[PDB]
Coordinates of all heavy atoms in Angstrom, one line a residue:
Chain C
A383 N 32.6 6.1 -7.1 CA 34.0 5.9 -6.9 C 34.6 4.8 -7.7 O 33.8 3.9 -8.1 CB 34.2 5.6 -5.4
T384 N 35.9 4.8 -8.0 CA 36.6 3.8 -8.8 C 37.7 3.2 -8.0 O 38.5 3.8 -7.4 CB 37.1 4.4 -10.1 OG1 38.0 5.5 -9.8 CG2 36.0 4.9 -11.0
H385 N 37.8 1.8 -8.1 CA 38.8 1.1 -7.4 C 39.7 0.3 -8.4 O 39.2 -0.1 -9.5 CB 38.2 0.1 -6.5 CG 37.3 0.7 -5.4 ND1 37.9 1.4 -4.3 CD2 36.0 0.8 -5.2 CE1 36.9 1.8 -3.5 NE2 35.8 1.5 -4.0
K386 N 40.9 0.0 -8.0 CA 41.8 -0.7 -8.9 C 41.7 -2.2 -8.5 O 41.4 -2.5 -7.3 CB 43.3 -0.3 -8.7 CG 43.5 1.2 -8.9 CD 45.0 1.5 -8.7 CE 45.3 2.9 -9.0 NZ 46.8 3.2 -8.7
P387 N 41.8 -3.1 -9.4 CA 41.6 -4.6 -9.1 C 42.6 -4.9 -8.0 O 43.7 -4.2 -7.9 CB 42.0 -5.3 -10.4 CG 41.5 -4.3 -11.4 CD 42.0 -3.0 -10.9
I388 N 42.3 -5.9 -7.1 CA 43.3 -6.2 -6.1 C 44.4 -7.1 -6.6 O 44.2 -8.0 -7.4 CB 42.5 -7.1 -5.0 CG1 41.4 -6.3 -4.4 CG2 43.5 -7.4 -3.9 CD1 41.7 -5.0 -3.8
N389 N 45.6 -6.8 -6.2 CA 46.8 -7.5 -6.7 C 46.8 -8.7 -5.7 O 47.3 -8.6 -4.6 CB 48.1 -6.7 -6.5 CG 49.2 -7.4 -7.2 OD1 49.6 -8.5 -6.8 ND2 49.9 -6.8 -8.1
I390 N 46.3 -9.9 -6.2 CA 46.3 -11.1 -5.4 C 47.6 -11.5 -4.8 O 47.8 -11.7 -3.6 CB 45.7 -12.3 -6.2 CG1 44.4 -11.9 -6.9 CG2 45.5 -13.5 -5.3 CD1 43.3 -11.5 -6.0
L391 N 48.6 -11.7 -5.7 CA 50.0 -12.1 -5.3 C 50.5 -11.3 -4.2 O 51.1 -11.8 -3.2 CB 50.9 -12.1 -6.5 CG 51.4 -13.5 -7.0 CD1 50.4 -14.6 -6.8 CD2 51.9 -13.3 -8.4
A393 N 48.8 -9.4 -2.0 CA 48.0 -9.5 -0.8 C 48.5 -10.8 0.0 O 48.5 -10.8 1.2 CB 46.5 -9.6 -1.2
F394 N 48.9 -11.8 -0.8 CA 49.3 -13.0 -0.2 C 50.7 -12.8 0.5 O 50.9 -13.2 1.6 CB 49.5 -14.1 -1.3 CG 48.2 -14.7 -1.7 CD1 48.1 -15.4 -3.0 CD2 47.1 -14.7 -0.9 CE1 46.9 -16.0 -3.4 CE2 45.9 -15.3 -1.3 CZ 45.8 -16.0 -2.6
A395 N 51.6 -12.2 -0.3 CA 53.0 -12.0 0.2 C 53.2 -11.0 1.3 O 54.0 -11.2 2.2 CB 53.9 -11.8 -1.0
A396 N 52.6 -9.8 1.1 CA 52.8 -8.7 2.0 C 51.8 -8.7 3.1 O 50.7 -9.2 3.0 CB 52.7 -7.4 1.2
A397 N 52.3 -8.3 4.3 CA 51.4 -8.2 5.5 C 50.5 -7.1 5.2 O 50.9 -6.0 4.8 CB 52.2 -8.0 6.7
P398 N 49.1 -7.3 5.3 CA 48.2 -6.3 5.1 C 48.3 -5.1 6.1 O 48.5 -5.3 7.3 CB 46.8 -7.0 5.3 CG 47.2 -8.0 6.3 CD 48.5 -8.5 5.9
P399 N 48.4 -3.9 5.6 CA 48.5 -2.7 6.5 C 47.4 -2.7 7.5 O 46.3 -3.1 7.3 CB 48.4 -1.5 5.5 CG 48.9 -2.1 4.2 CD 48.3 -3.5 4.2
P400 N 47.7 -2.3 8.8 CA 46.7 -2.2 9.8 C 45.5 -1.4 9.4 O 45.7 -0.3 8.8 CB 47.5 -1.6 11.0 CG 48.9 -2.0 10.8 CD 49.1 -1.8 9.3
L401 N 44.3 -1.9 9.7 CA 43.1 -1.2 9.3 C 43.1 0.2 10.0 O 43.5 0.3 11.1 CB 41.9 -2.0 9.7 CG 41.0 -2.7 8.7 CD1 41.9 -3.3 7.6 CD2 40.2 -3.8 9.3
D402 N 42.7 1.2 9.2 CA 42.7 2.6 9.7 C 41.3 2.9 10.2 O 40.3 2.9 9.5 CB 43.1 3.5 8.6 CG 43.0 5.0 9.0 OD1 43.1 5.3 10.2 OD2 42.8 5.8 8.1
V409 N 35.9 1.5 10.0 CA 37.0 1.7 9.0 C 36.9 3.0 8.3 O 35.8 3.4 7.8 CB 37.0 0.5 8.0 CG1 38.2 0.7 7.0 CG2 37.1 -0.8 8.6
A410 N 38.0 3.7 8.3 CA 38.0 5.0 7.6 C 37.6 4.9 6.1 O 38.0 3.9 5.5 CB 39.4 5.7 7.7
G411 N 36.8 5.8 5.6 CA 36.3 5.7 4.2 C 35.0 5.0 4.0 O 34.7 4.7 2.9
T412 N 34.3 4.8 5.1 CA 33.0 4.1 5.0 C 31.9 5.0 5.7 O 32.2 6.0 6.3 CB 33.0 2.7 5.7 OG1 33.2 2.9 7.1 CG2 34.1 1.9 5.1
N532 N 11.5 3.8 5.4 CA 11.1 2.4 5.5 C 11.1 1.7 4.1 O 10.7 0.6 4.0 CB 9.8 2.2 6.2 CG 8.7 3.0 5.5 OD1 8.3 2.8 4.4 ND2 8.1 4.0 6.2
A533 N 11.5 2.5 3.1 CA 11.5 2.0 1.7 C 12.9 1.6 1.3 O 13.7 2.5 1.2 CB 10.9 3.1 0.8
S534 N 13.1 0.3 1.2 CA 14.5 -0.2 0.9 C 15.1 0.4 -0.4 O 16.3 0.6 -0.5 CB 14.5 -1.7 0.8 OG 13.7 -2.2 -0.3
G535 N 14.3 0.5 -1.5 CA 14.8 1.0 -2.7 C 15.3 2.4 -2.6 O 16.5 2.6 -2.9
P536 N 14.5 3.3 -2.2 CA 14.9 4.7 -2.0 C 16.1 4.9 -1.1 O 17.0 5.7 -1.4 CB 13.6 5.4 -1.6 CG 12.6 4.7 -2.3 CD 13.0 3.2 -2.1
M537 N 16.0 4.3 0.1 CA 17.1 4.4 1.1 C 18.4 3.8 0.6 O 19.5 4.2 1.0 CB 16.7 3.8 2.4 CG 15.5 4.5 3.1 SD 15.8 6.3 3.1 CE 17.2 6.5 4.1
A538 N 18.3 2.8 -0.4 CA 19.5 2.2 -0.9 C 20.3 3.3 -1.7 O 21.5 3.3 -1.7 CB 19.1 1.1 -1.8
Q539 N 19.5 4.1 -2.4 CA 20.1 5.2 -3.2 C 20.7 6.3 -2.3 O 21.8 6.8 -2.5 CB 19.0 5.8 -4.1 CG 18.4 4.8 -5.1 CD 17.3 5.5 -5.9 OE1 17.6 6.2 -6.9 NE2 16.1 5.2 -5.6
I541 N 21.7 6.0 1.1 CA 22.8 5.5 1.7 C 23.9 5.2 0.7 O 25.1 5.5 1.0 CB 22.5 4.2 2.5 CG1 21.5 4.5 3.6 CG2 23.8 3.6 3.1 CD1 21.1 3.3 4.4
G542 N 23.6 4.8 -0.4 CA 24.5 4.5 -1.5 C 25.3 5.7 -1.9 O 26.5 5.6 -2.2
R543 N 24.7 6.9 -1.9 CA 25.4 8.1 -2.2 C 26.4 8.5 -1.2 O 27.4 9.0 -1.5 CB 24.4 9.2 -2.5 CG 23.6 9.0 -3.8 CD 23.0 10.3 -4.3 NE 22.4 10.1 -5.7 CZ 22.0 11.0 -6.5 NH1 22.2 12.3 -6.1 NH2 21.5 10.7 -7.7
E545 N 28.0 6.4 0.7 CA 29.0 5.4 0.5 C 29.9 5.9 -0.7 O 31.2 5.8 -0.6 CB 28.5 4.0 0.2 CG 27.4 3.5 1.1 CD 26.9 2.1 0.7 OE1 26.9 1.8 -0.5 OE2 26.4 1.4 1.6
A546 N 29.3 6.4 -1.7 CA 30.1 6.9 -2.9 C 31.0 8.1 -2.5 O 32.2 8.1 -2.9 CB 29.2 7.3 -4.0
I547 N 30.5 9.0 -1.7 CA 31.3 10.1 -1.2 C 32.5 9.7 -0.4 O 33.6 10.1 -0.6 CB 30.4 11.1 -0.4 CG1 29.5 11.9 -1.4 CG2 31.3 12.1 0.3 CD1 28.5 12.8 -0.7
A549 N 33.9 6.7 -0.1 CA 34.9 5.9 -0.9 C 35.7 6.7 -1.8 O 37.0 6.5 -1.8 CB 34.1 4.8 -1.7
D565 N 20.1 -2.2 8.3 CA 20.5 -3.3 7.4 C 21.4 -2.9 6.3 O 22.1 -3.7 5.7 CB 19.2 -3.9 6.9 CG 18.4 -4.7 7.9 OD1 18.8 -4.8 9.0 OD2 17.4 -5.3 7.5
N566 N 21.4 -1.6 6.0 CA 22.3 -1.0 5.0 C 23.5 -0.4 5.5 O 24.3 0.1 4.7 CB 21.5 0.0 4.2 CG 20.3 -0.5 3.5 OD1 19.5 0.2 2.9 ND2 20.1 -1.8 3.6
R568 N 27.1 -0.8 7.9 CA 28.1 -1.7 8.5 C 28.6 -1.4 9.9 O 29.1 -2.2 10.6 CB 29.3 -1.9 7.5 CG 28.9 -2.8 6.4 CD 30.2 -3.5 5.8 NE 29.9 -4.7 5.0 CZ 30.7 -5.6 4.6 NH1 32.0 -5.5 5.0 NH2 30.4 -6.6 3.9
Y604 N 34.9 -5.3 12.0 CA 36.4 -5.4 12.3 C 36.8 -4.8 13.6 O 36.1 -3.9 14.2 CB 37.2 -4.9 11.1 CG 36.6 -5.3 9.8 CD1 35.9 -4.4 9.0 CD2 36.7 -6.6 9.4 CE1 35.4 -4.8 7.8 CE2 36.1 -7.0 8.1 CZ 35.5 -6.1 7.4 OH 34.9 -6.5 6.2
Chain E
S405 N 30.9 -14.2 2.6 CA 32.0 -13.6 1.9 C 33.3 -14.5 1.8 O 34.0 -14.5 0.8 CB 32.3 -12.2 2.4 OG 31.3 -11.3 2.1
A437 N 30.9 -5.4 -3.2 CA 30.5 -4.1 -3.2 C 30.2 -3.4 -1.9 O 29.7 -2.3 -1.8 CB 29.2 -4.0 -4.1
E438 N 30.5 -4.2 -0.8 CA 30.2 -3.7 0.5 C 31.4 -3.6 1.5 O 31.4 -2.9 2.5 CB 29.1 -4.5 1.2 CG 28.0 -4.9 0.3 CD 26.8 -5.7 0.9 OE1 27.1 -6.5 1.8 OE2 25.7 -5.4 0.6
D439 N 32.5 -4.4 1.1 CA 33.7 -4.4 2.0 C 34.7 -3.4 1.6 O 35.0 -3.2 0.4 CB 34.3 -5.8 2.0 CG 33.4 -6.8 2.7 OD1 32.3 -7.1 2.2 OD2 33.9 -7.4 3.7
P440 N 35.3 -2.7 2.6 CA 36.4 -1.8 2.3 C 37.5 -2.6 1.7 O 37.8 -3.7 2.1 CB 36.8 -1.3 3.7 CG 35.5 -1.4 4.5 CD 35.0 -2.7 4.0
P441 N 38.2 -2.0 0.6 CA 39.3 -2.8 0.0 C 40.3 -3.3 0.9 O 40.8 -4.5 0.7 CB 39.9 -1.7 -1.0 CG 38.7 -0.9 -1.3 CD 38.0 -0.7 0.0
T442 N 40.7 -2.6 1.9 CA 41.7 -3.1 2.9 C 41.3 -4.3 3.6 O 42.2 -5.1 4.1 CB 42.2 -2.0 3.9 OG1 41.0 -1.4 4.5 CG2 43.0 -0.9 3.2
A443 N 40.0 -4.5 3.8 CA 39.5 -5.6 4.5 C 39.7 -6.9 3.6 O 40.0 -8.0 4.1 CB 38.0 -5.4 4.9
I444 N 39.5 -6.7 2.3 CA 39.7 -7.8 1.4 C 41.1 -8.3 1.4 O 41.4 -9.4 1.2 CB 39.3 -7.3 0.0 CG1 37.8 -6.9 -0.1 CG2 39.5 -8.5 -1.0 CD1 36.8 -7.9 0.4
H445 N 42.1 -7.3 1.6 CA 43.5 -7.7 1.6 C 43.8 -8.6 2.8 O 44.6 -9.5 2.7 CB 44.3 -6.4 1.8 CG 44.2 -5.4 0.6 ND1 44.6 -4.1 0.7 CD2 43.6 -5.6 -0.6 CE1 44.3 -3.5 -0.5 NE2 43.7 -4.4 -1.3
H446 N 43.1 -8.3 4.0 CA 43.3 -9.1 5.2 C 42.8 -10.5 5.0 O 43.3 -11.5 5.5 CB 42.7 -8.4 6.4 CG 43.5 -7.3 6.9 ND1 44.2 -7.4 8.1 CD2 43.7 -6.0 6.5 CE1 44.8 -6.3 8.3 NE2 44.5 -5.4 7.4
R447 N 41.6 -10.6 4.3 CA 41.0 -11.9 4.1 C 41.8 -12.8 3.2 O 42.0 -14.0 3.4 CB 39.6 -11.8 3.5 CG 38.8 -13.1 3.5 CD 37.4 -12.8 2.9 NE 36.7 -11.7 3.6 CZ 36.5 -11.6 4.9 NH1 36.8 -12.6 5.7 NH2 35.8 -10.5 5.3
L448 N 42.4 -12.2 2.1 CA 43.2 -12.9 1.2 C 44.5 -13.3 1.9 O 44.9 -14.5 1.6 CB 43.6 -11.9 0.0 CG 42.5 -11.8 -1.1 CD1 43.0 -10.6 -2.1 CD2 42.4 -13.1 -1.9
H449 N 45.1 -12.5 2.7 CA 46.3 -12.8 3.4 C 46.1 -14.0 4.3 O 46.9 -14.9 4.3 CB 46.8 -11.7 4.2 CG 48.2 -11.8 4.8 ND1 49.3 -11.6 4.0 CD2 48.6 -12.2 6.0 CE1 50.4 -11.9 4.7 NE2 50.0 -12.2 5.9
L451 N 43.8 -16.4 3.9 CA 43.6 -17.5 3.1 C 44.9 -18.0 2.5 O 45.2 -19.2 2.4 CB 42.6 -17.2 1.9 CG 42.3 -18.2 0.9 CD1 41.7 -19.5 1.5 CD2 41.3 -17.7 -0.1
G452 N 45.8 -17.1 2.2 CA 47.1 -17.4 1.7 C 47.9 -18.3 2.5 O 48.7 -19.1 2.0
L455 N 47.7 -21.8 1.4 CA 48.1 -22.2 0.1 C 49.6 -22.2 -0.1 O 50.3 -21.3 0.3 CB 47.5 -21.1 -0.9 CG 46.1 -21.3 -1.5 CD1 45.2 -22.2 -0.6 CD2 45.5 -19.9 -1.7
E459 N 50.0 -22.9 -5.5 CA 48.6 -22.7 -5.4 C 48.2 -21.3 -5.4 O 47.2 -20.9 -5.9 CB 48.1 -23.5 -4.1 CG 48.3 -25.0 -4.2 CD 48.0 -25.7 -2.9 OE1 48.3 -25.1 -1.8 OE2 47.5 -26.8 -2.9
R460 N 49.1 -20.4 -4.8 CA 48.8 -19.0 -4.8 C 48.9 -18.5 -6.2 O 48.1 -17.6 -6.6 CB 49.9 -18.3 -3.9 CG 49.8 -18.6 -2.4 CD 50.9 -17.9 -1.6 NE 50.9 -18.2 -0.2 CZ 51.6 -17.6 0.7 NH1 52.5 -16.7 0.4 NH2 51.5 -18.0 2.0
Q461 N 49.9 -18.9 -6.9 CA 50.0 -18.5 -8.3 C 48.8 -18.9 -9.1 O 48.3 -18.2 -9.9 CB 51.3 -19.1 -8.9 CG 51.6 -18.5 -10.3 CD 51.9 -17.0 -10.3 OE1 52.8 -16.6 -9.6 NE2 51.1 -16.3 -11.1
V463 N 45.7 -19.4 -8.1 CA 44.6 -18.5 -7.8 C 44.7 -17.2 -8.4 O 43.8 -16.7 -9.0 CB 44.5 -18.4 -6.2 CG1 43.4 -17.3 -5.9 CG2 44.1 -19.7 -5.6
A464 N 45.9 -16.6 -8.3 CA 46.2 -15.3 -8.9 C 46.0 -15.3 -10.4 O 45.6 -14.3 -11.0 CB 47.6 -14.8 -8.6
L467 N 41.8 -15.7 -10.9 CA 40.8 -14.9 -10.1 C 41.0 -13.4 -10.2 O 42.1 -12.9 -9.9 CB 40.8 -15.3 -8.7 CG 39.9 -14.5 -7.7 CD1 38.5 -14.7 -8.0 CD2 40.2 -14.9 -6.3
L468 N 40.0 -12.7 -10.5 CA 40.0 -11.2 -10.6 C 39.1 -10.7 -9.5 O 37.9 -11.1 -9.4 CB 39.6 -10.7 -12.0 CG 39.1 -9.2 -12.0 CD1 40.3 -8.3 -11.6 CD2 38.6 -8.9 -13.4
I469 N 39.5 -9.8 -8.7 CA 38.7 -9.2 -7.6 C 38.6 -7.7 -7.9 O 39.7 -7.0 -7.7 CB 39.3 -9.5 -6.2 CG1 39.3 -11.0 -6.0 CG2 38.3 -8.9 -5.2 CD1 39.9 -11.4 -4.7
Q470 N 37.5 -7.2 -8.2 CA 37.2 -5.8 -8.4 C 36.3 -5.1 -7.4 O 35.1 -5.3 -7.5 CB 36.6 -5.6 -9.8 CG 36.3 -4.1 -10.2 CD 37.5 -3.2 -10.2 OE1 38.4 -3.4 -11.0 NE2 37.5 -2.2 -9.3
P471 N 36.9 -4.4 -6.4 CA 36.1 -3.8 -5.4 C 35.1 -2.8 -6.0 O 35.5 -2.1 -7.0 CB 37.1 -3.1 -4.5 CG 38.3 -4.0 -4.7 CD 38.3 -4.2 -6.1
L472 N 33.9 -2.7 -5.5 CA 32.9 -1.8 -6.0 C 32.2 -1.0 -4.9 O 31.1 -0.4 -5.2 CB 31.8 -2.5 -6.8 CG 32.3 -3.3 -8.1 CD1 31.1 -4.0 -8.7 CD2 33.0 -2.4 -9.0
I473 N 32.8 -0.9 -3.7 CA 32.1 -0.1 -2.7 C 32.1 1.3 -3.1 O 33.1 1.9 -3.5 CB 32.9 -0.3 -1.3 CG1 32.1 0.4 -0.2 CG2 34.3 0.3 -1.4 CD1 32.8 0.3 1.2
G474 N 30.9 2.0 -3.0 CA 30.8 3.4 -3.4 C 30.6 3.6 -4.9 O 30.4 4.7 -5.3
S475 N 30.7 2.5 -5.7 CA 30.5 2.6 -7.1 C 29.0 2.6 -7.6 O 28.7 3.1 -8.6 CB 31.2 1.5 -7.8 OG 32.6 1.5 -7.5
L476 N 28.2 2.1 -6.7 CA 26.7 2.0 -6.9 C 26.3 1.3 -8.2 O 25.6 2.0 -9.1 CB 26.1 3.4 -6.8 CG 26.5 4.2 -5.6 CD1 25.7 5.4 -5.5 CD2 26.4 3.3 -4.3
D501 N 28.5 -9.7 -4.5 CA 28.5 -9.6 -3.0 C 28.2 -8.2 -2.4 O 29.1 -7.4 -2.4 CB 29.8 -10.2 -2.5 CG 29.9 -10.2 -1.0 OD1 28.9 -9.9 -0.3 OD2 31.1 -10.5 -0.5
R504 N 22.0 -6.8 -2.9 CA 21.4 -5.5 -2.6 C 22.1 -4.3 -3.2 O 21.5 -3.3 -3.4 CB 21.4 -5.4 -1.0 CG 20.8 -4.1 -0.4 CD 19.3 -3.9 -0.7 NE 19.1 -3.2 -2.0 CZ 17.9 -2.8 -2.4 NH1 16.8 -3.1 -1.7 NH2 17.8 -2.1 -3.5
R505 N 23.4 -4.4 -3.4 CA 24.1 -3.2 -3.9 C 24.3 -3.3 -5.5 O 25.1 -2.5 -6.0 CB 25.5 -3.1 -3.3 CG 25.5 -2.2 -2.1 CD 25.3 -0.7 -2.6 NE 25.0 0.2 -1.5 CZ 23.7 0.3 -1.0 NH1 22.7 -0.4 -1.5 NH2 23.5 1.1 0.0
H507 N 21.3 -3.2 -7.4 CA 20.0 -2.8 -7.9 C 19.4 -1.8 -6.9 O 19.9 -1.7 -5.7 CB 19.0 -3.9 -8.1 CG 18.5 -4.5 -6.8 ND1 17.3 -4.0 -6.3 CD2 18.9 -5.5 -6.0 CE1 17.0 -4.7 -5.2 NE2 18.0 -5.6 -5.0
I508 N 18.4 -1.0 -7.3 CA 17.8 0.0 -6.4 C 16.3 -0.2 -6.3 O 15.6 0.7 -6.0 CB 18.1 1.4 -7.0 CG1 17.4 1.6 -8.3 CG2 19.6 1.7 -7.1 CD1 17.5 3.0 -8.9
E509 N 15.9 -1.5 -6.5 CA 14.5 -1.8 -6.4 C 14.1 -2.3 -5.0 O 14.9 -2.4 -4.1 CB 14.1 -2.9 -7.3 CG 14.6 -2.8 -8.8 CD 14.1 -1.5 -9.4 OE1 13.0 -1.1 -9.1 OE2 14.8 -1.0 -10.3
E510 N 12.8 -2.5 -4.8 CA 12.2 -2.9 -3.5 C 12.3 -4.4 -3.7 O 11.7 -5.0 -4.6 CB 10.8 -2.5 -3.4 CG 10.3 -2.2 -2.0 CD 11.1 -1.1 -1.4 OE1 11.3 0.0 -2.0 OE2 11.4 -1.3 -0.2
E511 N 13.1 -5.1 -2.8 CA 13.2 -6.6 -2.9 C 11.9 -7.3 -2.6 O 11.9 -8.5 -2.8 CB 14.4 -7.1 -2.0 CG 15.7 -6.5 -2.4 CD 16.9 -7.2 -1.8 OE1 16.8 -7.7 -0.6 OE2 17.9 -7.4 -2.5
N512 N 10.9 -6.6 -2.3 CA 9.6 -7.1 -2.0 C 8.7 -7.1 -3.2 O 7.6 -7.8 -3.2 CB 8.9 -6.3 -0.8 CG 9.9 -6.0 0.3 OD1 10.4 -6.9 1.0 ND2 10.1 -4.7 0.5
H540 N 21.8 -11.5 2.2 CA 21.6 -11.5 3.6 C 20.2 -11.8 4.0 O 19.3 -11.2 3.5 CB 22.0 -10.1 4.3 CG 23.4 -9.8 4.1 ND1 24.5 -10.6 4.4 CD2 24.0 -8.6 3.8 CE1 25.6 -10.0 4.2 NE2 25.4 -8.7 3.9

Side-chain angles (χ1 to χ4, degrees):
Chain C
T384 54
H385 299 285
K386 302 181 180 181
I388 302 301
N389 187 302
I390 311 296
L391 247 35
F394 283 159
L401 254 37
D402 177 26
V409 182
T412 64
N532 57 62
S534 68
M537 294 314 294
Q539 302 179 74
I541 297 180
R543 291 199 172 195
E545 310 178 333
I547 288 175
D565 287 0
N566 298 175
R568 283 207 161 190
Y604 316 109
Chain E
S405 290
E438 320 184 322
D439 292 63
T442 49
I444 301 300
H445 299 164
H446 281 256
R447 190 180 310 301
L448 279 170
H449 193 77
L451 179 56
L455 275 24
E459 297 172 322
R460 293 176 179 188
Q461 187 64 59
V463 174
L467 175 68
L468 160 61
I469 301 178
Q470 176 61 62
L472 298 180
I473 187 179
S475 301
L476 311 190
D501 181 7
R504 181 64 267 187
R505 266 291 164 280
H507 77 89
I508 62 174
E509 311 302 329
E510 213 58 46
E511 300 197 320
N512 315 299
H540 294 313

